Design a protein around this ligand. Structure first.
Ligand SMILES: CC(=O)N[C@@H]1[C@@H](O)[C@H](O)[C@@H](CO)O[C@H]1O
Ligand SMILES: CC(=O)N[C@@H]1[C@@H](O)[C@H](O)[C@@H](CO)O[C@H]1O
Ligand SMILES: C[C@@H]1O[C@@H](O)[C@@H](O)[C@H](O)[C@@H]1O
Ligand SMILES: [Fe+3]
Ligand SMILES: [Fe+3]
Length: 686
């Protein structure tokens, strides 16, 4: 994506400002050219980037955190990649390195001396200080107006903690001048300096990363060891079973509101040219048998092997994870101490009709269920990943996109009241993907190209995945929009051909193609209405038809209706009667399931057995409120849900979906993963 612009890099040391000037000499000869600015701190760099003075910096996990907060909301545009044998990674392990032969365990660290990478840094500060507090060791039980975070000064006798401008005990083991021993860029900073601090005997432990012995002493690795959390010691190479955490790689932050394309163009180019095996001398990442610590980790960490572009949906919150974001938070802000599950579950509700239905559930339940609101499914999957909402019942297609994201199926929606439900329950039986047509017996399966189709929504089992999975296999073109003549598939780009037949809120202005019941044509019932009113095709499930037809839907569009007005389209070319599913469907597909973070999932499940005993379809207070009946159409739960089938503990979204449906939504998504699917693909790594 084209400029011919300068990118203003922000360096926070003069060593690093020399590797940056050597790099803009290495391609003054490109569309995208570099410029270098030097600031004392990365925090002078952050607001340098807030104001439009600078354009990039590769910040630690810890300082990507603070760059992502207001009044500058910089986001991660690329990440460092790292391994040896197995592949590449987007993360690293914080370790606590000790000398072989000293004899302290983790219990015994008090009145010891520590070498730190820096103040506010992951492996160096956040991981190990945060872990000491949590265990009991560092005694800090907040800043209400409690004096505080440098209470490590009390724990450690003296330390070397670069950036500390509060404590003196913390500046104490640092080599260098007087003014400059305790600077960020000072001699005992980074992984490599904190390692040297320990080599020297200026600390008893160094709070470093998993490659720090090997980049600094590959030669004398047998002389060092790791300090495990279980009150044992493990060898240098046993860090997979002896680390303190796994944090998000350092990553390049840049204004959201700007030129993230030129920075990635420069970076993409640079790396391709001056990468790991360059064809001679400028190396952007190059780290052998120890150099001088101040020479290490300039621009990018020496252990970085590539720079991986970060999907546009990612923020810092999402970038760091739920655990690490919240661990920063713990120590970084207030004592947040007796509210981990705040015993109300937050339901995620898509748009205003489900909100009102939810709100009623809250009332009625006596606030056992509480409610969150969002405009999309997509947006609701983000809140859950982020701990801002806890659960949502989703179509199987969204189950796939959610499981990719780390969320797990809790209860499967069963559409037999009847079959599978307790003792009764086996596995939520599967429904069927179907193609519905009207009167005209011209239209066939094999004649749809050019038709005027209708879809439940984009990325919905029945409404999109089966239909488009199937068409796409035929054609082998990622052209979806340009197959049908015009259509409705809410959540489609507004410009699309597939945003053409949507009618939004009534038609009454509001919102012509959103994926919510704010859109006229959203859901299974929404796209039958499209058939009836505009559509040529309706991609729906097997009972839609027989749910709204012969006096079942009492809407005016549906008023006249009968199942005689509809037929099904077979894949063989032929047609059939709606009341014939087993013999003429698009495919047999898994049900709708409620998903949650895996930690949350066993008290969601009892919440729901609780609520179902009361508001389910043989509920005790079902006169007060029936959970599975909607005042519009499907709202929270599909409207003819009979019960919620319990998934056994630790079931993955793949096992839930099965291999057929797993393989069709994988294969379809080889073409145009949505932004939430791209954030979550990235993050399977974390
Ligand atoms: C390309 C692809 O995803 N294929 C999937 C895979 O799960 C399976 O091997 C095959 C059926 O046996 O077709 C389907
Ligand atoms: C019905 C359907 O969508 N089938 C899918 C398809 O996307 C793909 O072609 C196949 C293996 O190639 O795996 C499955
Ligand atoms: C049984 C068949 O062979 C194996 C899978 O990889 C297939 O796609 C299918 O399930
Ligand atoms: Fe780091
Ligand atoms: Fe569905």
């Amino acid at each position: 994506a084209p400029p011919k612009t300068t990118v203003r890099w922000c360096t926070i040391s003069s060593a690093e400002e020399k590797k940056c000037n050597s790099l803009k000499d290495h391609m003054q000869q490109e569309r995208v050219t570099l410029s270098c600015v030097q600031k004392a701190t990365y925090l002078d760099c952050i607001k340098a980037i807030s104001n439009n003075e600078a354009d990039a910096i590769s910040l630690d996990g810890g300082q990507v955190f603070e760059a992502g907060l207001a009044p500058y909301k910089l986001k991660p545009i690329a990440a460092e990649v790292y391994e040896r044998s197995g592949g590449s990674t987007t993360s690293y392990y914080a370790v606590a390195v000790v000398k072989k032969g000293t004899d302290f365990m983790i219990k015994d660290l008090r009145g010891k001396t520590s070498c730190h990478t820096g103040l506010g840094r992951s492996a160096g500060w956040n991981i190990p200080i945060g872990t000491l507090i949590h265990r009991e060791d560092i005694e800090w039980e907040g800043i209400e107006s409690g004096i505080s975070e440098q209470a490590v000064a009390k724990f450690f006798s003296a330390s070397c903690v670069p950036g500390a401008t509060i404590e003196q005990k913390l500046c104490r083991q640092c080599k260098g001048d007087a003014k400059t021993k305790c600077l960020r860029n000072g001699p005992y900073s980074g992984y490599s300096g904190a390692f040297q601090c320990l080599k020297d005997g200026k600390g008893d432990v160094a709070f470093v990363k998993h490659t720090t012995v090997q980049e600094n002493a590959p030669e004398e690795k047998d002389e060092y060891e790791l300090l495990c959390l279980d009150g044992s010691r493990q060898p240098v190479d046993s860090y997979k079973t002896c680390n303190w955490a796994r944090v998000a790689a350092h990553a390049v932050v840049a204004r959201d509101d700007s030129k993230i394309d030129d920075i990635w163009s420069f970076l993409g180019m640079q790396a391709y040219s001056l990468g790991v095996d360059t064809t001679s001398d400028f190396h952007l990442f190059g780290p052998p048998g120890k150099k001088d610590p101040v020479l290490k980790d300039l621009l990018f960490k020496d252990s970085a092997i590539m720079l991986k572009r970060v999907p546009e949906l990612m923020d810092s919150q999402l970038y760091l994870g739920f655990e690490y974001y919240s661990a920063i938070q713990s120590l970084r802000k207030d004592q947040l101490t007796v509210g981990p599950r705040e015993n109300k579950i937050q339901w995620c509700a898509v748009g205003k009709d489900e909100k009102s239905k939810c709100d009623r559930w809250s009332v009625v339940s006596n606030g056992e269920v509480e409610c969150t609101i969002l405009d999309d499914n997509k947006d609701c999957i983000v809140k859950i990943t982020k701990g801002e909402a806890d659960a949502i019942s989703l179509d199987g297609g969204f189950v796939y996109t959610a499981g990719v994201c780390g969320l797990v199926p809790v209860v499967g929606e069963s559409y037999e009241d009847e079959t599978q439900c307790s003792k009764d329950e086996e596995q939520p039986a599967y429904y069927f993907a179907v193609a519905v047509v009207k009167k005209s017996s011209a239209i066939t399966w094999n004649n749809l190209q050019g038709k005027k189709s209708c879809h439940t929504a984009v990325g919905r089992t029945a409404g999109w995945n089966i239909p488009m999975g199937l068409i796409h296999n035929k054609t082998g073109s990622c052209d979806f929009d340009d197959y049908f003549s015009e259509g409705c598939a809410p959540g489609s780009p507004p410009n699309s051909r597939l945003c053409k037949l949507c009618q939004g809120s009534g038609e009454n202005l509001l919102e012509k193609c959103v994926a919510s019941s704010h859109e006229k044509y959203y859901g299974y019932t929404g796209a039958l209405r499209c058939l009836v009113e505009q559509g040529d095709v309706a991609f729906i499930k097997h009972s839609t038809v027989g749910e709204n037809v012969s006096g079942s839907n009492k809407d005016d569009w549906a008023k006249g209706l009968t199942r005689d007005d509809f037929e099904l389209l077979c894949t063989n070319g032929k047609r059939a009667k709606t009341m014939d599913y087993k013999t003429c469907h698009l495919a047999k597909v898994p049900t709708h399931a409620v998903v949650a973070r895996p930690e949350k999932a066993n008290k969601i499940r009892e919440l729901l057995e609780g609520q179902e005993k009361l508001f389910g379809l043989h509920g005790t207070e079902k006169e007060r409120f029936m959970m599975f009946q909607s005042q519009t159409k499907d709202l929270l739960f599909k409207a003819l849900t009979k019960c919620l089938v319990k998934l056994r503990q630790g079931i993955t979204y793949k096992e839930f979906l099965g291999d057929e449906y797993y393989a069709s939504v994988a294969s379809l998504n080889t073409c145009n993963p949505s932004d939430l699917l791209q954030v979550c693909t990235f993050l399977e790594d974390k």
